[PDB]
């Protein structure tokens, strides 16, 4: 059975056939046609605040380095030397004056131009051997990249998202904490888990203290109560109402938290006393933003959280959670690290356990597609539809 | 060279060509056509004595759960939730009231029927979404399963084995100890090792104190001495003489132990003072039973041992040894755990070393089939013939 | 794109396309057509000085045992028993009277003849079941093997090398130390690294104290200064001038060390006070010998170092470094182990880091061939040309 035959018979109401989650064949297609073609969230721009600052990441098999250039522009490159291919930057982050290959010291400017290569002979043309650029955009303080030479339209998303994101002043953030975990499930299982709260009541004690179980929230006609919330926010100058992409790739909405909760903490109170941004009112709740295939995000009045989803193998996925706070917020004074991070550290661990257990069952040859809950899993169906449509379009002529 | 060409040129007197032991291709065929098609030993029924008791196991890629239902019947199911596929039972063993999926709490009765699924809509038909059954038989206190929807005949074996097994009263056993090891060799190498004692004199000091080296015993015209033993047993009402399957799949015989030994212990005396069963006389020896591809067994007058062979990868096999004693036998009083288990713990470790060393040599491209000993390895040839015949029949039309 | 199409478009001046370094497909071809076909360095003959002495090694998937036979000849065999295939010698080295299989004790003479096999029946012909020989040569105290039944010409190399190697009296050596490391890069990356010192100034502080950076040395018209060195050696009876194989497989030359250095030590002085061989004058420097694909070597006046390169996987290579000293040199008296070994232990660790970092960059799909330095990497181009030519010839008719 070919991939085309499986896609042909797929019904929207059901989980995917086994090979979509387990096969090296589909994994290769997901990299080739999804991760290597779409815009992806990389890191917050505040990680590149300093002169000569760089950060590195892997995307599938690609090695990327993002750097703050002399002119203050942030640029991304393939972290592969044009001589014999070596990584140039080995550390996760650092600062340099130039990009100097550790092997034979070919030396590049922070805009990628090759400025020195030792003893290469008279016929060497350094202009042919600069670092290969990676397409890059700045979404209001969040850096996105695209590995394709012909990137899709990012501007439609950027323009829609700006009014929602600008009130968070993310350019003025710092990273308070980063957590990187490997979940032993296919990247699609990580997404299907994220896009519903059908599992939340039984699995997430800590999160449920602040995050509502209502399908309207975690998932996808606006209820009167929800509309009232949007109106409180927007009367105060804080954009809140739904935005959903035409093709389903992204969504934004600012949702209410549980009864009286203001933040993702065990006591429901703000984690940080010096807020990141100018969000009002104080109970504006959580700005939810997803953008497939790389990221979901929760921006609160006091701090923000970004999540980055990267594929590792057919049955492994890396999830990176970053806590953003105001750059002038002081650990031990304006926030406590445990208080700030404990809810989502626990939640992520619970999701990982669930995803791994789901993956273990799916590996049985007895596993067959089952029906999603229309009421509780509309967001899961929405994701699976986006994925299948994306794959179909990429495989077409 | 195709699998069919290799099977075509195979001669009975020789070990198999390399790919049978090392190739992912043959490993996939062995799962598809052998392990996924034949009856397999799972666990003793005494593991499921209690109300709501369950046990889990993996067979190749299948995840199975065996449960004692309300009506007292033991049943097996695919341990994959009909919603999104999750394992339902994660522990090796336990007790439940219902089978409740840890993900979104779909809840099944112990007969597999789906009795509650939250918010699935008006068009949801729970009768289509019960757990998928796994075929199951009870061989006189030992649970066997078959992953095929069209299982082979088990009744012929069951009827032949009953008179031999019933005298052991296995329904009245408890598990005194279980040992699970991974041997780094193909499952067929584990079997070829088991089916001869050509290696025993040099490799098994402890076992040789009680287990005879005679090829007649470990392996396949009955000698006068052996016939005399069968007659002592059968005069006392204990079935002992050879039973061999028409197609070679299974064999039973009650064999004498070494000079004066009564059990598999370092001193040769019974391990347990309260015997499991009604075997007579006290020196009735060891009831040997194999059933390919999953199990060999030694049932003694005082206790019994079951062995389960499960494939892990082309060059890895899991062997599970279970010691059964009378349910009323008390550790520290009627038996000592070290005394009961030390002989076969050592023996299994020695076999593992031998199998791994054999596998290491076989991985050389210089390895070629060699001749089995007609006198010392007739049982190995018998196994290899059963395997090749089974594969041929499965590949045919 | 087929292997043939990649080979067709290859230009000499450039590093190889990705799959040559990363693909399982090319790895299989490199084993089949290079490692399994050419002469390979195994071990120094002094490891087999004693009666009944043996040593074992793996080459790709082959398991080899080399043994000193009763008649004093050194012979090699496939370390796979002719019965059911088991390794016979499990230890890295040892002494035996006979080669006795640990499984069922088939017993072979040290010339490989099967002299005892238990209970094999009347129709068993032991003359058909001796150990399979491996072709073997002794290069003046260094043992080389070839896994092909039709080995290439070794004599041309042997005759050229003898005058250079005989002055080292390697038959009179002992092994002072052996270091075995795994480098996480393709075997070709290990070679490309070895065949240039373009990386040395920045990466090898310790080695640079004694080993010149001059491209003439580490790499490939002889300079006046170098000729003067050759002449000092040869006037003293020590062969030194270049020898390069017609087909590029091997090279020998005795090169000067840095200003006043005599040996590879932190202080530049001889590591061992009792010299291995009769090399003169004392500042004769380092005899460099490579022989693709298995070995590079440095023979100094006081001690010698051999290096053996063996493939482990597409992105892993085992490098074994052996320090040879005079058999009568006493550790703690004539040499200090740290002083003798520290320079190359550090150097090998630095090379490993470089190779692994190079491999990591090459794994990016953005990696493309880049140009080698004509002045600094002529030896790298020479190796890559030898490799590609070897592969082309093996794939031809
Ligand atoms: O491992 C390294 O050195 C860089 C960091 C991100 C992945 N590649
Ligand atoms: O790992 C688990 O949770 C179950 C137990 C047997 C194999 N699958
Ligand atoms: O592992 C062993 O026992 C032998 C030693 C070299 C490789 N094979
Ligand atoms: S690989 Fe970067 S300078 Fe050589
Ligand atoms: S996967 Fe079992 S209830 Fe959802
Ligand atoms: S495998 Fe060597 S004697 Fe049997
Ligand atoms: Fe969750
Ligand atoms: Fe054994
Ligand atoms: Fe080096």
GROMACS .gro file of N, CA and C and ligand atoms in nm, chain B residues 81 83-86 101 103-106, ligand 5:
model
   34
  478UNK      N    1  -0.611   0.066   2.313
  478UNK     CA    2  -0.740   0.131   2.324
  478UNK      C    3  -0.800   0.161   2.187
  480UNK      N    4  -0.992   0.396   2.098
  480UNK     CA    5  -1.001   0.539   2.071
  480UNK      C    6  -0.879   0.582   1.989
  481UNK      N    7  -0.767   0.610   2.056
  481UNK     CA    8  -0.649   0.654   1.983
  481UNK      C    9  -0.531   0.559   1.998
  482UNK      N   10  -0.555   0.439   2.053
  482UNK     CA   11  -0.457   0.332   2.044
  482UNK      C   12  -0.370   0.304   2.166
  483UNK      N   13  -0.382   0.387   2.269
  483UNK     CA   14  -0.296   0.377   2.387
  483UNK      C   15  -0.293   0.239   2.454
  498UNK      N   16  -0.872   0.314   3.020
  498UNK     CA   17  -0.760   0.373   2.947
  498UNK      C   18  -0.709   0.495   3.020
  500UNK      N   19  -0.552   0.745   2.909
  500UNK     CA   20  -0.547   0.867   2.829
  500UNK      C   21  -0.675   0.949   2.845
  501UNK      N   22  -0.788   0.896   2.796
  501UNK     CA   23  -0.916   0.967   2.806
  501UNK      C   24  -1.024   0.884   2.874
  502UNK      N   25  -0.981   0.779   2.945
  502UNK     CA   26  -1.067   0.701   3.034
  502UNK      C   27  -1.180   0.625   2.968
  503UNK      N   28  -1.168   0.591   2.840
  503UNK     CA   29  -1.260   0.492   2.787
  503UNK      C   30  -1.249   0.369   2.874
 1196LIG     S1   31  -0.661   0.652   2.373
 1196LIG    FE1   32  -0.781   0.542   2.523
 1196LIG     S2   33  -0.940   0.680   2.586
 1196LIG    FE2   34  -0.825   0.788   2.434
   0.00000   0.00000   0.00000
